[PDB]
């Protein structure tokens, strides 16, 4: 009603509507899925179909490496993601300078959440309409870490999380296909699961999917078009064989 | 005193008489042993009937005098003609609050319909003293006893003129930084009067 005109106004039922509106702005962005494996983390992102005259050499990638061991994908307004990514990179370098140790995944997630929360504490500022997924491994550690951060400044730890547009379908697919007692053992299984989850919403297929795989000792690999195409073709062939009988 | 500045080594006098006040000074400005300016008007005016003479550093005293004249113009716009006590208070505050950066000493002579002429002295440091007469400068030290032996209350105008002329002539005679002509300003009820006396007149005294 009249309680949605500022971030500093509580509604009678106990809600802040501007935060919900920022989440609504997030929901329009492209889908982004993160899957935690036994020894790897896979981040998949949906890309809009590139236009005929659009260049395909210099377009910014959906997945950005904040640090040699930590990557970050987003969903929402593409312009605010650059600001958040730059701040995260500067903070990671500052922490390495000050404490001689690279940041942990939870530390960077908490810093990003703190920045997003701080940008909600003034009436003359606009909160970032971006929801982020942060993935990686702690230094000299073999435990995968995946976190989700929301515009209000709230962050959570997940084993498989989808954000963005049509994320409810992918979330239901993961809930019906992912079990925390039996995470995928190999990288290939995680990549296949991520591709199959993304194919629920992606209209075309291999040309609208971007995949980044993170493994311990700072092993970050961005899959090429050919590998994702191979995964998509294998998944489609298996689906056709299953539907035949 | 900062190195390389200009020192106001002079002979300053101010005497209160029956009908008002008279402020007198010499006209010599020296830089070491060389007389930089042998015709200098040291009778600085800060208000229509409020005058002053400066000593110490020329730049600091000029800045303080300009600020005091600004302050008195504001006061006159607001409340009217100020008394000599107000001007002396402004001078004292300016000299005292900046005594760690500026070296300045002032002798203030004034007149008004109530107090009928007053003399104040602010030496180095910023203290203020109200006296029937005041002397200052490097050349004053030679006339102290003389000034203590020939001053009378409620003298006439001519007697005060002669007293100031004799005392300043002796100070000029015995001081190396004092010389030139004698300039005197008479502040009474009638108005402001200017007097100048040449060496050939006071050296024969």
């Amino acid at each position: 009603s009249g309680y949605d005109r500022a971030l500093s106004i509580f509604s009678p039922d106990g809600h802040i509507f501007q935060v919900e509106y920022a989440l609504e702005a997030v929901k329009r962005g492209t889908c982004a899925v993160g899957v935690k494996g036994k020894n790897c983390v896979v981040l998949g992102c949906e890309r809009r179909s590139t236009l005929k005259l659009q260049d395909t050499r210099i377009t910014p990638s959906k997945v950005s490496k904040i640090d040699s061991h930590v990557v970050l994908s987003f969903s929402g307004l593409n312009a605010d993601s650059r600001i958040l990514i730059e701040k995260a990179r500067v903070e990671a370098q500052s922490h390495r300078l000050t404490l001689e140790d690279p940041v942990t995944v939870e530390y960077l997630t908490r810093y990003v959440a703190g920045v997003q929360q701080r940008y909600t504490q003034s009436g003359g500022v606009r909160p970032f309409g971006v929801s982020t997924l942060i993935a990686g491994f702690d230094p000299r550690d073999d435990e995968p870490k995946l976190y989700q951060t929301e515009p209000s400044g709230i962050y959570s730890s997940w084993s498989a999380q989808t954000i963005g547009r049509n994320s409810k379908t992918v979330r239901e697919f993961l809930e019906k296909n992912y079990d925390r007692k039996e995470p995928p053992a190999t990288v290939e299984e995680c990549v296949k699961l991520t591709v199959r989850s993304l194919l629920e919403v992606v209209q075309t297929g291999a040309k609208n999917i971007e995949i980044t795989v993170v493994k311990p000792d700072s092993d970050i690999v961005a899959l090429s078009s050919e590998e994702i195409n191979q995964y998509v073709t294998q998944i489609e062939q298996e689906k056709q064989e299953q539907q035949e009988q | 005193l900062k190195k390389g500045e200009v020192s106001l080594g002079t002979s300053i006098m101010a005497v209160t008489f029956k009908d008002g006040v008279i402020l007198g000074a010499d006209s010599r400005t020296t830089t070491g042993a060389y007389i930089a300016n042998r015709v200098t008007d040291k009778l600085t005016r800060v208000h229509d009937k409020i005058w002053c003479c400066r000593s110490g550093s020329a730049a600091d005293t000029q800045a303080i005098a300009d600020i005091v004249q600004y302050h008195l113009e504001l006061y006159t716009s607001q409340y009217g003609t100020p008394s000599t006590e107000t001007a002396a208070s402004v001078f004292k505050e300016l000299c005292y609050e900046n005594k760690d950066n500026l070296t300045a000493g002032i002798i203030v002579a004034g007149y008004d319909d109530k107090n009928k002429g007053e003399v104040y002295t602010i030496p180095l440091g910023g203290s203020v003293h109200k006296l029937p007469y005041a002397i200052a400068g490097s050349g004053s030290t030679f006339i102290y006893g003389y000034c203590d032996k020939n001053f009378r209350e409620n003298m006439s105008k001519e007697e005060t003129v002669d007293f100031i002329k004799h005392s300043l002539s002796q100070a000029i005679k015995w001081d190396g930084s004092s010389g030139g002509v004698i300039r005197m300003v008479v502040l009474t009820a009638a108005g402001v009067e200017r007097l100048i006396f040449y060496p050939d007149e006071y050296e024969q005294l």
């Binding site: - | 004249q69 600004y70 504001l74 716009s77």
Partner: protein
Amino acid sequence: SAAGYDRHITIFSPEGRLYQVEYAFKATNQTNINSLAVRGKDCTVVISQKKVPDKLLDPTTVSYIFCISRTIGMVVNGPIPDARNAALRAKAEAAEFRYKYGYDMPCDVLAKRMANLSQIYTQRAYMRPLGVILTFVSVDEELGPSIYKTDPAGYYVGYKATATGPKQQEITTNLENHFKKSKIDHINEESWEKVVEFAITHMIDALGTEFSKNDLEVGVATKDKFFTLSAENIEERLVAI
């Protein structure tokens, strides 16, 4: 009346106007008194109308003429609180000019300074214009007798003669007719008393029904000093026609 905003701040209406400035201009005529300024050969005379509806009020404390400095006098048309605010600011500005530039402030420079302040008030959203009209009269050492008027809009201009008030049109037309007849942009009289008498006569024949010594306020600016006449001086001027 403003439609949406412009009832509070000074921004452009769809027609391209500042309504708050116009309302401040309208607020200047609340006192219902008139003032007239004329130039002599070597003097300037300002005459204002005094009204004392309340018999309990002390007449000596009612005044709209101020002494900004030794040479500059000011006449304010409008409410007295803003009048006193403007008077104090003008005094401060003149003294600061004298301190900073080493010579007395001319009338036109002070008028331009007040006009710049008025422009600040008209452009800033969180500042309001003062609903007064200022008239500075003096005898500049380079321009002779001088009259300069400034309004809430930020506009200042000099006048050979001027009149401001609820009935300014009659006085302005009468002055224009007199100047057309005599073909002189000033008054050819060597004494300020005759100029005061002429201004009193002009005010009498403009407003009508005459007035006494307690219904007038006269200020005279010469090349030496600006001063304000008392009841006896005004009465003596009234006696001489």
